C-alpha cells in the first residue's frame, strides 16, 4: 500500500491528534485533491513530490453509510519533496 504523487500545495494545517502535533497539506493533483499527513521549504503553492503510505481510513456516519476519508501517511522512507 505505497503511494507516490506530484501536485501543488493548496492548503496547510497545523493540528493535533492525541498528545502529538501534526502538519497536514492539501495536495492538488490533476483536478483532484488528497490530504498529506506528517506525524527551500514546503510552502503554500509549492509544487511537491510526495511519497508515503496511503490510508483509506473508512468511517461510519451516524442508513449509516461507510465513506472513505483517505490520506497519505508520511514518516525515514516517507517524504514530501519540493520540486
Amino acid at each position, epitope marked *: 500500500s505505497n503511494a507516490l504523487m506530484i501536485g501543488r500545495i493548496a492548503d496547510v*494545517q497545523h*493540528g*493535533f491528534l*492525541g498528545a502529538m502535533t501534526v502538519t497536514q497539506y*492539501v495536495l492538488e493533483v490533476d483536478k483532484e485533491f488528497i*490530504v498529506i499527513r506528517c506525524m527551500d521549504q514546503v510552502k503554500l503553492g509549492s509544487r511537491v513530490l510526495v511519497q508515503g503510505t496511503l490510508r483509506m481510513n473508512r*468511517h461510519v456516519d451516524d442508513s449509516k453509510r461507510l465513506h472513505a*476519508y483517505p490520506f497519505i501517511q508520511v514518516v525515514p522512507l516517507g517524504y514530501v519533496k519540493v520540486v
Partner: nanobody
Amino acid sequence: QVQLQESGGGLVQAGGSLRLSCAASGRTSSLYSMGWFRQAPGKEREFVAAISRNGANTYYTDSVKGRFTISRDNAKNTVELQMNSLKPEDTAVYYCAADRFPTMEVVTIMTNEYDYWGQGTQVTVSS
C-alpha cells in the same frame, strides 16, 4: 457564505457557569474543525478550545483545562462551550471559528488557519 451565530454569554459571578453555543448556517458542508477563541480588551485573541469534525479530538489552552468542555452536534450544526468554575481571568469577548481544511479527525490549533468567524459574544465574570 457561512454565518456563525453565537449565544449563551453574559454576566455571572465567579464560580458561576455558562453554556456558549455556536450555530452554523450557510454552506456547513465545507466546515471541519471548529474552535472557541477569546479576546480581552487591549490584548489579542487567544485560543480557548477546538474540536475535530468527528468530535473525537479536542484541544484546550492550559488555563481552561478541567473547567471548560467542548462538544459538537453535527446534525444540529452546533458546537458548545461548557464553562464551569468561571474566574475573573475568564472575562473576554468569546468568538467561535470554523476551518475549511478537509480533515475528519485532526483538530486545528493555529488561529490564522481558521477561515470563518462569529461576531462575538460578551462574557463577564465579577469577583
